[PDB]
Every structure is written in structure tokens, then in C-alpha cells.
Amino acid sequence: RRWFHPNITGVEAENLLLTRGVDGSFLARPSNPGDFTLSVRRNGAVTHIKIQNTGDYYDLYGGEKFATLAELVQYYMEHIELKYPLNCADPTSERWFHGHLSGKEAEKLLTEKGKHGSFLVREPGDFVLSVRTGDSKVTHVMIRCQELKYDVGGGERFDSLTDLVEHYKKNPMVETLGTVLQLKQPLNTTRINAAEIESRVRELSKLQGFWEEFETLQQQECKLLYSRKEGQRQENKNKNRYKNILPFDHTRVVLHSDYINANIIMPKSYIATQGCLQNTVNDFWRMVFQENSRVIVMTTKEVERGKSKCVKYWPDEYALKEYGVMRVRNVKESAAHDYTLRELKLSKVGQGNTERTVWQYHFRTWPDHGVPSDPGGVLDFLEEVHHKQESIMDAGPVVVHCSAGIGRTGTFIVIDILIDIIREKGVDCDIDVPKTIQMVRSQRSGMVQTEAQYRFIYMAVQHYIETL
Ligand SMILES: Cc1ccc(-c2cc(C(=O)O)c3c(-c4ccc(Br)cc4)n[nH]c3n2)cc1
């Protein structure tokens, strides 16, 4: 993911491309903060293409809609031509990069938070590689910066700290008396005690800290390019709301004709899916039935800004409808402040004994762009959803959806995952927001789409602990 330059300007981007690149060279950078710019070289000139993400997907101007920036780049490199990634040397979005950090502070961190193989890189004008080894000690390796090249006092001179770190991860530096300086995993600084979330939110709100943590998580997306072949099949093309936002094959819900754009999320399980299309309503009810799901979480209006986000897949109040082999009666609608509850009865046509109640929780007040200013409404809604799921003996995974089923869906599921760890293990437990997002993202592409949702997840977890 070296093509992503987090701290450069358009002018700097143009100079890089016209001097260090050729025609077909490109890079992506953050813009209007929240937006992104694909800066490409074509015929000795630079084109700047806009990428928008209000929380649902990456929308490339003159292109398609994508689950991740890595996925957008992989597509255009396998299909203006995107030929040569212009590499970034800047290590700010690296998990191990701590910058302004002292030898005592680094030793504190490796001693408490660290285990064997834990390492970090901190900053005169030179850098330090601090490693923990044992079962233990901490070793400090000097990193000379000479003419914008990095070295450990001898051997190879690297173009960036990244190339240095990667090199010494594969071939570890061996101390004269046997000890191999293994770089096994970055120091896990994002793992915190739940009860101290407020202190971390304060530090993250300083000069922002939330932007560095999120982009460091975004940098790990290139490790999640799992196959999405079933979704690409000719027979399955129009079963997708967005042609390029597909389910991973290894986690997709298989229907026992077997396709739905949905994925099982294992942290109580979830099904992360898209908003129904006219032609997938019957596939949605087959899935709910088969999975034995008793709760559905809808986090979108049917129509937002004049565009259909999800078709009406449920009958009107008191009405009975058949959707293929599946039968649904809307028993009762209950309208709360932020949401509407719909009590549905699902059964197989021709089998009276298969009947079960499906509680549909429709959140109706989420803003068209961005996230709610306060998490109270979302938390209260999640609490009710949790209590319903809990009261139902042997219930299947909770179905969660919005439009593409990755942004608002991912956000709701992750909050639910974190507030659940707290429920079980109590206020004195460890929680790691990006480790949780990364674990959910390996089960469905681009789960949690923006920095605004990322910050909202932190605000949600903080507000839950405050009222505990
Ligand atoms: C100065 C400074 C600021 C922020 C960080 C930092 C550290 C980590 C980390 O590895 O603990 C991560 C992560 C993360 C965590 C686990 C997994 Br699996 C995937 C991503 N995401 N964002 C992060 N930011 C480090 C130094």
C-alpha cells in the first residue's frame, strides 16, 4: 500500500509524478477533508481524480464504487491508465512508527504492553529501533539517516524506514552472543483498558490523533485482498447493488441459486448484507430462514437523497405476502423516536410447523452524510436489539444491513462487538478498536468506511461506559 501518501499536497504530488514517475504513474492522497485524490501522470501531465466517501463507499469520479482504496487500485491495475504505483517513504501510517518518543517512554511501553518480538521505531535526526526479546530484555538499534537513506551502521542503505524494517523482519539482526533481534509484531499501543477510554479519546482529540490511528489501520487493508469470485460470476452479477462491492468467498452466506451478497461475521454472530434489490428479496428471506436469524437491523431509509438504498422487503402492517417459497406476515409496527420495530412471522409455504417471529429494527434517523452528532440514540437502539436477541432461545445470527452493507453496517456491528466485551468481562477488560475493525474487515470488505465512523465508534464505547 506504498502508493498512499497521507501527508502531501497536490503541488507536491505533481512534482513527485513529473520527476520520480513516468506516464502511467499514480498515487492516492487525502484531499475537502474526508475526500481523497488519485493523482495520475498521462502524456507528461498530472490529472487529479476525486474519491468521495460520506460513509457508504469510495466513489471514484468517472469510475466505479469501491469497498476499499486497495480494492479500487487492484481493479484498475487488472483492468487514464493506472500502471506504476509511486511509492511513499513517509512512515507515519506504520503501526511500529512512534516518532517523537524517548528511550524511557519506549522502554515503559515494551515492558507493560510488549511481549517477545515486539518492536517500535522512534526518533538527532536519526531513529531508534527498540526491540523486546525473551519469554526478557529491551535492545536499542541506532538508525542513521544519511542523505535521505536509512541504515543500522553497516550493509545496505534503504530508501525508507519501511524497506529497512521489512528487510530486518525477514533477515533478523543477530547480536554477537546468539540473541536474534526478531521483529515479530508492532507494539500494541491501541489496546487499552475500557475504564480509561475517556483518557485515550482526549489524547486522540489532540493535535488529529484520530487521523493517525485510522490511517495506520487503513494501511493494513492491502493484507485483506481475499477472493470474491462467486460475486464476479455472470449468473451473480445483477445480485449485487454495487458491481465491485462483493462478498469474500470464504465467509459468504451459501444458500441451500446459492448466492446472496452477504457474509457471516464471527466476533453472537452477524450477517453483514446489502439492502435488497427487487430481484434479491426472495434470496434475502431464504437466507433469514436457513440461518434461523430472529432479528434484522436496518440502518438506512428506503430512499435517501432521491436514491433507492434498499427495496421494501417486508409487507405493510397486518398484510401477508409470499416471496417465493417464503411467507411473511407483518404482525405489528411499533414507532419509537429513532427507529421503528416491525414484528414479522416467517414460514415456509406448505409447512405450518416452520413459523418463527422475526423482529426487524429499522433505524430511521441516521444522517444522509456523516454520522449522528451524539451516540445516545444508536446505543439505546443497540441495547434493545441486544435484549431481543438474548431472550430468543437458539436464535441465529443477527442480520445487519444498510445500502452496500459495509459502512453503517460495519460501524453498528463493531460498536455491538465492543459494548458486548464490556457486558461480559466488565468495565475492567481490554478493548482494541482497530484490532476489532481489522478482524471484522477480514470477513467483509471495507467494514467501517470513514474516520468519522471510526471516531463515532470511540464516542459510542465512551458513552456506554459513562452510563454503566
Ligand atoms: C504514535 C502512534 C499512533 C498510533 C499507532 C497505532 C498502533 C497500532 C497497533 O498496532 O497497535 C494501530 C492499529 C492496528 C492495531 C492492530 C491491528 Br491487527 C491492526 C491495526 N491501527 N492504528 C494503529 N495505530 C502507533 C503509534
Sheet-strand content, in percent, reads 25-35%
The CATH class of the largest domain is Alpha Beta
Biggest sheet details:
8 strands, mixed
**How many H/I helical runs?**
12
> How far is the first residue's CA from the last residue's CA?
40 Å
Catalytic activity: O-phospho-L-tyrosyl-[protein] + H2O = L-tyrosyl-[protein] + phosphate
Enzyme class: hydrolase
Keywords: Acetylation, Cytoplasm, Deafness, Disease variant, Hydrolase, Nucleus, Phosphoprotein, Protein phosphatase, Repeat, SH2 domain
Pfam families: SH2 (PF00017), Y_phosphatase (PF00102)
Task: Tell me what you see in this structure.
- This protein is 28% helix and 26% strand.
- With 468 residues, it is of the alpha+beta class.
- It folds into three domains: 1-93, 2-Layer Sandwich (SHC Adaptor Protein), CATH 3.30.505; 94-186, SHC Adaptor Protein (2-Layer Sandwich), CATH 3.30.505; 187-468, Alpha-Beta Complex (Protein-Tyrosine Phosphatase, Chain A).
- A hairpin with a 2-residue loop joins β19 (303-304) and β20.
- α10 packs across α11 (433-441).
- The longest helix is centred in the C-terminal third of the chain and has 18 residues, at 408-425.
- Residues 95, 98, 186, 188-190, 212-213, 216-217, 220, 434-435, 438 line the site of the ligand Cc1ccc(-c2cc(C(=O)O)c3c(-c4ccc(Br)cc4)n[nH]c3n2)cc1.
- It is classed as hydrolase/hydrolase inhibitor.
- Keywords: SHP2, ptpn11, protein tyrosine phosphatase, phosphatase, allosteric inhibitor, hydrolase.
